[PDB]
């Protein structure tokens, strides 16, 4: 196939200028304790961390409590029998009315997300799972991009749980993309670590609570695809359909050893994570506030040390930034629009004309295709510019 972009689909253009900080999505606030006045407005410049908007349901993640039910030992309910029902298919506004009035009539739910980042610059969910003691639902978070956020209504209700395992970047991506937000998280994978189980994967539980075998056969895969494959459906599904489950068992056994109240801190911590551009990270890297992290070579001169001989680190940042910009501007990621290694063999054999960028022993992408002659004369420029120096 070919996967037209998404993004050329969505009804407000993404931004990868950077030109300031993130701004919550976020138009409506149920489950509100604080209005959503106080929430968009900005905390200029700190030492500490630069001019940034807060996170708009910090104050009831702090505040507003977990239902009663969720400090109490409880009869566990086994997951549906997988074939008993087949995963919902979501992608109307129609489909997604339904299922919020199912989801409204829950204690708990268990939600994951599937993600995007070859074909875009900060990324893009592709999917979004969710299931409740009856059903699973898959949903089309790149057609409903813009309605999702009325899930907030049950995903802010602190009264009914929201089971996700290891939601750390859910919650950036959720934010970040649907503008969606969580209160009355409870995170498997801090609940695996309390209790101190050998391992802490959602595939380790599933093994050995759920006796389903998974298979990362997917992790490199691409959710942008529709229809998504059976496997792929499948294996989507497999993230929630046993959650709950797991969750009766984890829950029981923290209450049942007094661990419940790190657990819940913990969760609530996650859910109160924040997603900020680099342009405007604290100066102090912490787990309360996210910003992209290069999934490549070190800042400029990489430490992949391609025996990047001393002169060419100007080449190389110049390269970087180049790239970077190309990326911003296409959205694309880096990689896509040249990889390290290409970056590298570039430095390496600095070519001067066409001829030598495009035939480039290594092979090429089609941005530097596409821009062959702009970077040879980058290139030439560089070289130029080092003969003359000293």
């Known amino acids: 196939g070919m996967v ?14 950077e030109s300031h900080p993130f701004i919550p999505l976020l138009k409506e606030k149920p489950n509100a304790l604080k209005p959503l006045s106080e929430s968009l407005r900005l905390v200029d410049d700190d030492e500490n961390n630069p001019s940034h908007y807060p996170h708009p349901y910090e104050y009831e993640i702090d505040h507003q409590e977990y239902s009663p039910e969720i400090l109490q030992i409880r ?13 919902i298919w979501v992608d109307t506004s129609t489909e997604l009315e339904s299922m919020l009035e199912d989801l409204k009539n829950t204690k708990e739910i268990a939600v994951d997300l599937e993600h995007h980042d070859y074909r875009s610059y900060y990324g893009i969910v592709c999917l979004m799972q969710i299931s409740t003691r009856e059903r699973d639902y898959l949903v089309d978070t790149l057609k409903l991009r813009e309605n999702l956020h009325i899930l907030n209504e049950v995903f802010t209700n602190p009264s009914i749980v929201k089971v996700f395992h290891g939601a750390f970047m859910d919650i950036i991506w959720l934010q970040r993309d649907l503008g969606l937000y969580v209160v009355g998280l409870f995170d498997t994978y801090h609940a695996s670590k309390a209790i101190g189980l050998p391992r802490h994967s959602l595939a380790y539980l599933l093994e050995n609570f759920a006796n389903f075998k998974t298979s990362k056969k997917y992790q490199l895969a691409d959710w942008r695809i529709r229809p998504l494959s059976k496997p792929m459906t499948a294996a989507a599904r ?3 359909h046993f959650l709950l489950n797991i969750y009766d068992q984890l829950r029981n056994k923290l209450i049942e050893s007094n661990k419940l109240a790190g657990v819940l801190y913990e969760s609530r911590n996650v859910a109160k994570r924040r997603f900020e551009y680099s342009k405007y990270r604290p100066l102090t890297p912490s787990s309360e506030v996210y910003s992209p992290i290069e ?7 990489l430490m992949y040390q391609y025996n990047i001989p001393p002169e060419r680190e ?3 940042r110049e390269l970087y930034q180049w790239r970077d910009l190309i990326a911003r501007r296409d959205d694309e ?3 896509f629009v040249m990889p390290n ?5 570039l430095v390496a054999y600095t070519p001067t004309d066409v001829i030598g960028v495009v035939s ?13 002659k702009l970077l040879a004369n980058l290139i030439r420029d560089a070289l130029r510019n080092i003969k003359n120096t000293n």
């Open 333 to 335: 990621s880096p990689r």
């Open 238 to 240: 497999a993230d929630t």
């Open 75 to 87: 009869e566990e309910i086994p997951s549906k029998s997988w074939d008993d029902s087949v995963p």
């Open 341 to 345: 290694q290409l970056l590298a063999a």
């Open 295 to 301: 999934k490549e070579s070190p800042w400029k001169i």
């Open 4 to 17: 037209e972009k998404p993004q050329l689909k969505f009804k407000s253009p993404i931004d990868n200028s």
């Open 314 to 316: 100007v080449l190389v």
């Open 360 to 372: 480039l022993t290594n092979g090429v992408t089609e941005h530097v295709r596409q821009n062959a």
